[PDB]
């Protein structure tokens, strides 16, 4: 699609950035006080204020603009219809597996690459007089100057709602290059965010060789992306990715299988066992479900209290329903693609039956 001035007049800035358009006012950038800087580990998440024009502009961009730009089929994340199961599905046909991760994927995306990627889809015309164009007006609502990273340019925040679509759009040249390189050598390539999974069906040591890593690094160096050696995994006939086990016994066309290890399902089994042992709900959610009431309970306004029991009923029901949704998403993926172990299927059927029984018990108790 192509976005001209009139499109931005009443679609992406219908009400928010309207007063600036009429009164010959350049659209401002994002101020420091307009964002929060939350922390989790050694990671910084930029949270934009909900009541802000930039948030509305980002929502309209993600609904109308950043939803029609073509992407690469290897991008299985942040795309309507993409999923982790679809990210792991194509590798069932391979015998050798390799996993790579791009280090600081969102922080290493140069703003010039984003500008050059979004230029073909935005008309190169001035918006607010002969002061500001239309491309930079769109970009001002996407990026943010990070005080932590000094004056190194407009770094794409890791918490903005427009970040995933922009990342997938800008990582299309690299996706095409890597896909072509793997096609020339018979390697199946799939990317989820910044995890790249490569599968080789043939009996070769290409994925375990340093040449493959060197080629991937050389390709990624075009746009300035590196890969950390901490989580480089090269294995044969079996690979575990965050509990998802892909296993192929090998051959000349044998079909692999995808299952989930007991480590992935350990928490739900512990919860079900605790429910079987009639453990009180006080310590089944503050230990297993890592959900707990804060000290500032009942907003420091009510006096009835007693909300702890109903909270520990509600949140437990929600957790059981969500994990049930996860398991039945797995079984529907199996029905659609037929790449899941039968014993794992019967095991998750039994677990689903147990979860349904426990949900019925909890709802009867309330």
């Amino acid at each position: 699609i192509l976005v001209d001035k009139v499109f931005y007049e009443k679609i992406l800035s219908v009400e928010s950035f309207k007063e600036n358009i009429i009164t010959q006012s350049a659209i401002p950038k994002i101020s420091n006080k307009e964002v929060r800087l939350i922390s989790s580990g050694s990671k910084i998440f930029y949270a934009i204020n909900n009541t802000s024009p930039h948030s509305h502009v980002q929502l309209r961009l993600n609904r109308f603009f950043l939803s029609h730009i073509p992407l690469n089929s290897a991008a299985k994340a942040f795309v309507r219809g993409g999923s982790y199961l679809k990210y792991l599905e194509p590798h069932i046909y391979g015998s050798s597996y390799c996993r790579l991760d791009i280090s600081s994927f969102f922080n290493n995306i140069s703003f010039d690459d984003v500008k050059q990627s979004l230029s073909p889809y935005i008309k190169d015309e001035y918006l607010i007089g002969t002061e500001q164009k239309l491309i930079d007006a769109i970009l001002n609502s996407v990026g943010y100057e990070s005080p932590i990273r000094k004056d190194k340019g407009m770094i794409i925040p890791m918490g903005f709602r427009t970040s995933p679509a922009i990342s997938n759009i800008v990582f299309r040249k690299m996706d095409l290059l890597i896909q072509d390189f793997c096609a020339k050598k018979g390697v199946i390539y799939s990317r989820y965010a910044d995890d790249m999974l490569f599968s080789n069906p043939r009996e070769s040591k290409l994925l375990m060789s340093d040449y493959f890593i060197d080629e991937i690094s050389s390709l990624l160096s075009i746009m300035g992306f590196n890969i950390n050696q901490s989580k480089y995994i090269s294995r044969e006939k079996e690979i575990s990715i965050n509990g998802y086990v892909i296993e192929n016994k090998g051959g000349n066309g044998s079909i692999g299988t995808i299952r989930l290890s007991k480590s992935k399902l350990n928490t739900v089994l512990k919860v079900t066992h605790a429910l079987a042992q009639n453990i009180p709900y006080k310590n089944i959610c503050n230990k297993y479900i890592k959900v707990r009431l804060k000290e500032k309970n009942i907003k420091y306004e009510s006096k009835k209290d007693e909300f702890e029991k109903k909270y520990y009923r509600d949140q437990l029901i929600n957790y059981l329903g969500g994990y049930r949704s996860y398991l039945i998403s797995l079984v529907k993926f199996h029905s659609e693609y037929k790449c899941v172990n039968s014993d794992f299927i019967i095991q998750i059927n039994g677990i689903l039956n147990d979860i349904q029984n426990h949900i019925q018990k909890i709802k009867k108790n309330r």
Binding site: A183, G250, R324
Partner: protein, 732 residues
């Protein structure tokens, strides 16, 4: 025996996977481009299997550098054949040296012991990747494997629209490939000597002629295929629909003592064929399919247990599909292609197996027509068939004509199971409120039918977390549960409701059941036609009858009219005179000017008298609507019919009035006061003609129709919106 065909980023396929293939797989749909692209993909894959220089297929989008075609073969029969000890043959060893060799030598002495239980199935996957630089490579880098796969599972394409009768290339190819005889042991010299001995005026006369002919036409030696073709031609005594049927029979017969499993694709088998010819073709295919089948008690020579080759059809004729469903049964499937919103072919399996034998046996052209549809409206009743197939109404709405109206009860709906094919063939089930709730005058209480309780149970969203917006469903379910109270007072001898309104309940039920593709009307089908706003037009319709369908019986009209006037009073005895003068007659003779004026005056007087009597006997101006509704087999707001009211002994005075009008005043309309009498068609035609005469623009006509018929026009507009929402998908 393929089990999976996957196409990614080629032609019109983004990611399309085909599975659960059967013997008589049939392909239908308006997206002929999709069928052509699938056939091109299959032909390209099988050409690249045999190493033929062909143009690579185009990508669906250029933002992908890879185009994949994945074929999965069920190598279970072949593995069992080659694994057995008593199969020490060169070809058997060749098969168990390239396919089932890499997966056996690399395993220990435990894995294979679980593969001899005669219960597991073996799959062989082969992937063709087309790169951006027009370079094609395979998952397995062994041409022997590809050649063996092509030989074991060949692909045959038969085109009937462009078929040459003189050339029998597929027949001779099948004969040469499918044989169990070695022709290398035949001595050409011995055969020539035998021929010479057969025709010999002297010893050694044909030999010199043969030598001279060979010398004067000396060319390249015959190949094995040419030799076997010539031997078959001299061995046999003989060289559109008949050609294809013979080819299919030959292929089926040959594939009875061979482990080769061919794949047959036939495009448009019914071009230039009578429907009986297509039905006979499918019947002959089923006969040859069943003749070579042995099941338990069925045994003896001539019957085999060899799996049948997969046959693919591309048919636009409902006859072939109907016969395939009726005869084959569980050994067939129907694949609908259609398209997507952005433009991309889909493949969905349409329900073709029915658990009811009666439905399968009485399966007809309408049921096969439902599969060649883009929107099906399921109705219970022939009156709805009359109303929604009215030609005079469809021309004003050139979007509901694309929808097909089907009369089906609950059993037929369950057999068809439209929910299985929902994204391919959108459907709406139109029913009445009486199928959900029921009312009793003697016990003044609502009751819930099992259908409504089943729908509620289906809509109970248990085993669910908390999400925004999905909070009022539980409240609606609770309200639909608690409306079962007995507090509902009925006035007018149990005909109306004092405070309750079924309009709001019907609207709420429709709102909650929109997601289940069901629409429930407030009243019966006659309710939407006979309403208050339709009272004038309906009355005019009655007048039309009095002016059209009833003519003078006597051959001399003037004398009879004069005698009746001098004998019967024109004012007090007007009804007996009208009954004795006008009768039922299709012809409309033209009388004298005075006679015509007298007849018109009498008709106008009778119309005025009936209008005055109707307005005087009933005062509320609404009870007449209910009376007319119950006259034509309708229902009240209490969900009671005239017969049910008669059996329950309710509204005795109302039934007496209805009887008086039927047997005294509206006696000429008695034949039309029954269902399936065609009164709906006549009333709609007359109303539409009158509105067209009054209003000029078609938009005004549609607005007037919406005013007079709110529910019918609402349903039509909803169906039209549903069709136009997916117009770009269900259209070639």
């Amino acid at each position: 025996t393929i089990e999976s065909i996957r196409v990614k980023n080629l032609l019109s396929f983004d990611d399309v996977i085909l599975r659960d293939f059967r013997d008589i797989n049939c392909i239908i749909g308006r997206n002929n481009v999709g069928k052509s692209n699938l056939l091109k993909v299959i032909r390209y894959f099988y050409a690249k299997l045999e190493n033929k220089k062909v143009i690579p297929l185009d990508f669906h989008t250029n933002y992908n550098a890879v185009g994949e075609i994945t074929f999965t073969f069920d190598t279970t029969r072949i593995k069992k054949i080659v694994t057995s000890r008593k199969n020490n043959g060169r070809f058997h060893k060749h098969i168990y040296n390239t396919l089932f060799k890499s997966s056996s030598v690399k395993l220990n002495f435990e894995e294979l012991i679980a593969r001899k239980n005669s219960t597991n199935k073996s799959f062989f996957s082969l992937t063709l990747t087309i790169c951006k630089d027009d370079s094609v490579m395979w998952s397995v880098d062994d041409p022997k494997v590809r050649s063996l796969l092509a030989t074991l599972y060949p692909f045959l394409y038969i085109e009937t629209r462009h078929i040459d009768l003189y050339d029998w290339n597929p027949i001779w190819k099948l004969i040469s490939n499918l044989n169990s005889f070695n022709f290398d042991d035949v001595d050409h010299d011995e055969l020539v000597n035998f021929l010479d001995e057969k025709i010999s005026s002297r010893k050694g006369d044909y030999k010199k002629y043969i030598d001279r002919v060979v010398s004067v036409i000396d060319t390249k030696p015959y190949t094995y295929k040419e030799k076997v073709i010539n031997y078959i031609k001299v061995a046999i005594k003989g060289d559109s629909n008949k050609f294809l049927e013979t080819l299919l029979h030959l292929l089926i017969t040959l594939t009875r003592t061979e482990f080769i499993s061919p794949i047959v694709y036939i495009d448009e088998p019914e071009v230039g064929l009578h429907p009986k010819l297509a039905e006979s073709f499918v019947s002959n295919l089923n006969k040859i399919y069943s003749k070579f089948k042995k099941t338990s008690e069925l045994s003896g020579p001539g019957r085999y247990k060899t799996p049948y080759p997969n046959i693919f059809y591309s048919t636009h004729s409902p006859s072939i599909l109907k016969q395939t469903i009726k005869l084959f049964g569980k050994d067939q499937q129907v694949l609908h292609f259609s398209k997507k919103k952005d433009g991309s072919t889909r493949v969905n399996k349409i329900n073709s197996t029915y658990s009811d034998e009666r439905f399968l046996n009485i399966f007809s052209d309408n049921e096969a027509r439902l599969f060649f549809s883009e929107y099906i409206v399921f109705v219970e009743g022939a009156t709805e068939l009359e109303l929604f197939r009215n030609l005079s109404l469809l021309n004003l709405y050139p979007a509901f004509s694309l929808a097909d109206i089907y009369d089906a009860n609950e059993v037929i709906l369950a057999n068809i199971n439209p929910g299985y094919s929902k994204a391919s063939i959108p459907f709406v089930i139109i029913k009445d409120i009486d199928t959900l709730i029921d009312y009793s005058i003697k016990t003044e209480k609502f009751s819930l039918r099992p259908l409504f309780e089943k729908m509620i149970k289906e809509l109970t969203k248990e085993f669910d977390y908390y999400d925004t917006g999905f909070g009022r469903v539980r409240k609606e379910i609770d309200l639909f549960s608690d409306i079962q109270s007995s507090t509902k007072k009925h006035m007018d001898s149990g005909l109306f409701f004092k405070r309750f309104s079924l309009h709001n309940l019907s609207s709420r039920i429709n709102k909650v059941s929109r997601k289940l593709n069901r629409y429930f009307m407030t009243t019966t089908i006659e309710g939407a036609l006979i309403n208050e706003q339709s009272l004038p037009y309906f009355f005019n319709w009655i007048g039309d009858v009095i002016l059209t369908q009833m003519t003078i019986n006597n051959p001399n009209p003037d004398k009879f009219i004069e005698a009746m006037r001098r004998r019967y009073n024109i004012k007090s005895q007007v009804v007996p005179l009208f009954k004795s003068v006008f009768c039922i007659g299709l012809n409309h003779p033209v009388y004298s000017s005075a006679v015509d004026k007298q007849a018109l005056r009498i008709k106008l007087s009778f119309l005025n008298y009936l209008k005055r009597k109707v307005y005087s006997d009933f005062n509320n101006e609404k009870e007449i609507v209910l009376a007319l509704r119950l006259a034509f087999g309708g229902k009240t707001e209490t969900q009671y019919t005239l017969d049910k009211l008669r059996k329950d002994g309710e509204a005795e005075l109302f039934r007496e009035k209805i009887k008086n009008y039927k047997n005294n005043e509206l006696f000429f309309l008695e034949p039309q006061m029954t269902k399936t009498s065609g009164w709906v068609t006549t009333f709609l035609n007359y109303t539409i003609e009158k509105i067209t005469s009054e209003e000029s623009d078609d938009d005004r006509i549609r607005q007037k129709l919406s005013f007079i018929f709110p529910e019918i026009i609402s349903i039509i507009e909803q169906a039209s919106s549903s069709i136009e929402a997916e117009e770009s998908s269900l259209t070639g």
